Amino acid sequence: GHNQVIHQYFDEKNTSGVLVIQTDKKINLYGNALSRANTEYVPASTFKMLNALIGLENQKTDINEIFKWKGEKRSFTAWEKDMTLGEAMKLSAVPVYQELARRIGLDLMQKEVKRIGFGNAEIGQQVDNFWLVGPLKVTPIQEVEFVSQLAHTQLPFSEKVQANVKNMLLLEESNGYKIFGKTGWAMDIKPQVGWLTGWVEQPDGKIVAFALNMEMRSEMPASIRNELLMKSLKQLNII
Numbered sequence: 609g610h611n612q613v614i615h616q617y618f619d620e621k622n623t624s625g626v627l628v629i630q631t632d633k634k635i636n637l638y639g640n641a642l643s644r645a646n647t648e649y650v651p652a653s654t655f656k657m658l659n660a661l662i663g664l665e666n667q668k669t670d671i672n673e674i675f676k677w678k679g680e681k682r683s684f685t686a687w688e689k690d691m692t693l694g695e696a697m698k699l700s701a702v703p704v705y706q707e708l709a710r711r712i713g714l715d716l717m718q719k720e721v722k723r724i725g726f727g728n729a730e731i732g733q734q735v736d737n738f739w740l741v742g743p744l745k746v747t748p749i750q751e752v753e754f755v756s757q758l759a760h761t762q763l764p765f766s767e768k769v770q771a772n773v774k775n776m777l778l779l780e781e782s783n784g785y786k787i788f789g790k791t792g793w794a795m796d797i798k799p800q801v802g803w804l805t806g807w808v809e810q811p812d813g814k815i816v817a818f819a820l821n822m823e824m825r826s827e828m829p830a831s832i833r834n835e836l837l838m839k840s841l842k843q844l845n846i847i
């Protein structure tokens with residue numbers, strides 16, 4: 609419940625960021641840089657959540673389709689394989705979502721993103737990269753509401769599409785608890801911005817949504833977004 613101690617894990621991991629908690633439309637802030645919570649950032653791979661929903665709902669793909677790897681080299685060897693939407697989500701495989709995005713196309717993408725009102729709701733002109741280098745931007749409080757709605761099936765999509773994307777996002781399962789969430793890491797902008805947006809599904813059915821945002825640098829291990837989040841949810845006794 610403090611708020612000062614959570615400042616000190618942020619203090620020591622020599623980062624700058626904010627953890628936004630939403631418990632039934634009540635927003636709390638934690639970190640060492642609470643001002644981040646209202647500044648716009650590129651969403652990075654957290655936009656895969658809304659990309660999937662738009663693609664599924666408009667029947668540009670489905671949860672069974674297998675995306676074929678056509679042999680070109682990709683940033684990670686784990687990405688060099690055939691995979692579904694959901695497997696691409698768990699690995700944040702940009703090429704699959706770029707292909708998806710190109711099927712949706714610019715008009716449909718822009719119309720949906722502003723109908724959802726996602727962040728600043730601007731995708732510019734290149735349909736396959738606006739979530740990594742602009743011009744699409746989003747504050748971390750806006751991300752905790754988005755994933756909050758998704759968790760309660762309240763987004764302006766059908767419920768079956770939402771439920772489909774939610775099963776793509778299961779991260780841990782321990783003690784009757786479930787953690788869902790999506791990581792992001794914009795490595796190609798300065799300063800780098802890391803994301804971990806999701807929700808906790810407590811055994812009694814309660815839902816607490818979070819959006820960890822932090823400045824990033826090339827040397828940190830990717831698990832730093834998980835470490836900081838997990839021990840903050842334990843400190844706040846959400847888990």
Ligand SMILES: *C(=O)[C@H]([C@@H](C)O)[C@H]1CC(SCCNC=N)=C(C(=O)O)N1
Binds near residue numbers: 652653654684698794
């Ligand atoms: C999403 O935010 C980025 C995007 C900018 O490429 C990618 C890069 C990193 S690391 C890839 C993890 N691979 C696999 N098993 C992530 C991320 O997972 O946070 N997403």
